[PDB]
Every structure is written in structure tokens, then in C-alpha cells.
Amino acid sequence: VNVPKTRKTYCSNKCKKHTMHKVSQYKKGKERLSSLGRRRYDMKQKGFGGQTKPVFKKKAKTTKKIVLKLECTKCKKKRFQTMKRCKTFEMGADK
Amino acid sequence: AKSKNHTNHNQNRKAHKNGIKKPKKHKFMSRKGLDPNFFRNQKYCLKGIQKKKKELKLKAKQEKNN
């Protein structure tokens, strides 16, 4: 599935109207140590007793919902747009 | 372990024990979903009619007292 790098579409906030946005792929971030659940989990895990939470070994999907980051040309805002679960994904280089 | 699947048996007969209940058929019905613009104008009209009734009632009462 293929989207171009730019799209004229509605900005809701700080720009109030249809304008250009640059279009990019969300990369799914990365965890930091100072998160509350991780703090709790590390403390509980620590000491005698082995593993203290489930381990999600089971899996059924090789695919992912794709979610675009829309970055406003006019204003400094980001906006999300999510779309159908895909095994195949492309940016630019049209047919 | 080897179960029976289904039957509709007796359910209709059970329904007929208290009968099949039917609408209460109210003359007024809550109108949240009904046509914006036209319904807010109706709200203004209704408020207008209430105001018209209020103006009539207040003036008539004040006239009667005098």
C-alpha cells in the first residue's frame, strides 16, 4: 500500500483549515526507564522469586495497522491518521 | 463430551404464558435525534409561544388587579 510524501488536508488546531502537510510513518517509539509501570515492575521483579509478570510468547499476526504522522506545513503541529492492517507498505515511487 | 445442539421447543409456548408484550404507544417521544436547525427553530418557536403566553398572562393578570 502506497502513500505520497505530502497531502493537502484539514488542520484542526493552530491552523483551522485545509493546508499542506508532510506525511511520514510512525516508528513506534522506545521505552524509557522512568515510566511508572516499569518502576513498579522492576521493583517487584527484583529480589528472590524469578519472573513476576506474563511473557507474551503467543502470536497470530505478522501484520500491523499503519499510522501516518501528518506534520503541518502552516503550523508546528502533528496529527495522526491510521489506516487498514497491512503486510505490504510503501512511501512514494508511484506506478 | 457429545452434547445435544439446539431446540426452539416450548419457547413459543412460554412466550404465550405472559403473552407477547407490545408498545405503550405514547403521544410524546424524546426528540434528541430529530433534524437540527429545524428543531432548534422549533425550540425558538416554542420558547416564542411560551413568551407570547407569558406576556398575555402577565398583562391580563396585571389588568385584572389594575
Binding site: - | 419457547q11 412460554k14 412466550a15 405472559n18 407477547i20 408484550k21 407490545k22 408498545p23 417521544m29 435525534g33 430529530l34 433534524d35
Partner: protein, 155 residues
């Protein structure tokens, strides 16, 4: 087994023969009021606003009208209870109902009859009375022109 939206509609949502393609504009022009009764009868060409299987050929009151939609309160039996359910349908699927039209015609004739009866100062009975009473009757057929019948024999 499966239970998707159009489940079991092969025969039911087929076109009638010689009725294929888009239907006349003048169907759509038909005028509807709030509190009309209206039948839900569906041509299969226009696919948006298509009601569920149960509501085909059903009748109910219009409670709401929109741009090309009509809300219709239809009764559905849900096990041990009938309840009123808000079926949104299209201009395409609404047919003006006819039970009301018999009442209207009946009222009109009755009103003229009421005017006449009041004018003449004599009571009338409106009632759509019984079928079964027959007066005494005559057969004037010649006595040898009557048809003589007997049972039918075998092959």
C-alpha cells in the same frame, strides 16, 4: 453458520423480471409527511440505506424525514416481546401506505352521508356490517332448460 448483513438474501433481494436497472424519477418526487404510514419495499439498484431482511414489505409510521432519508418506526418481535425500532430507509424504498387511504375514502363518503343524514334529519349506521344474510330468491329458467347432471365415470 455465518451471520453477515445480507445473509440469506439471494432470492429475496433479486430483481423482478422486466424491472431491471434504475427506476423513474417520479417515484422519488412522491410527497411524505411526518406521521404518515409508509411501506418499506426495496428496489435492489441503490445499495446505500438498504434495510435489514425483516423490514422488507413491513409498514410503519414516519417519525423523521431527512435530506434523502426517512425514519420509520417499525415493530419487531424479539422473542417474548414486540418493540418499536427506528428503521432509516431511503426515498427509493418508501411506498405510501394504503390502509390509511381506505380510511380516508371511507371518512370522505361517510362525511357526505353525515351531511345528507343531518340535512334530512334521519339516523344512519356507518358500520361495515356482516356478510351472510341472503333474501328469498327466484329462478325463472324454463323447466326443461335447467341443466341435468350426473357423476363422472372412469378412464
Amino acid at each position: 453458520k455465518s451471520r453477515g448483513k445480507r445473509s440469506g438474501t439471494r432470492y429475496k433481494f433479486s430483481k423482478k423480471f422486466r424491472k431491471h436497472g434504475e427506476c423513474t424519477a417520479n417515484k422519488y418526487l412522491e410527497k411524505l409527511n411526518y406521521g404518515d404510514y409508509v411501506d418499506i419495499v426495496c428496489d435492489s439498484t441503490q445499495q446505500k440505506g438498504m434495510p435489514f431482511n425483516y423490514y422488507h414489505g413491513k409498514t410503519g409510521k414516519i417519525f423523521h424525514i431527512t435530506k434523502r432519508g426517512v425514519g420509520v418506526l417499525v415493530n419487531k418481535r424479539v422473542k417474548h416481546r414486540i418493540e418499536q425500532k427506528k428503521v432509516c430507509v431511503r426515498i427509493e424504498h418508501v411506498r405510501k401506505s394504503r390502509c390509511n387511504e381506505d380510511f380516508l375514502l371511507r371518512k370522505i363518503k361517510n362525511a357526505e352521508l353525515i351531511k345528507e343524514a343531518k340535512l334530512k334529519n334521519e339516523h344512519i349506521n356507518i358500520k361495515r356490517k356482516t356478510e351472510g344474510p341472503k333474501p328469498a330468491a327466484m329462478i325463472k329458467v324454463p323447466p326443461s332448460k335447467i341443466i341435468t347432471i350426473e357423476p363422472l365415470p372412469f378412464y
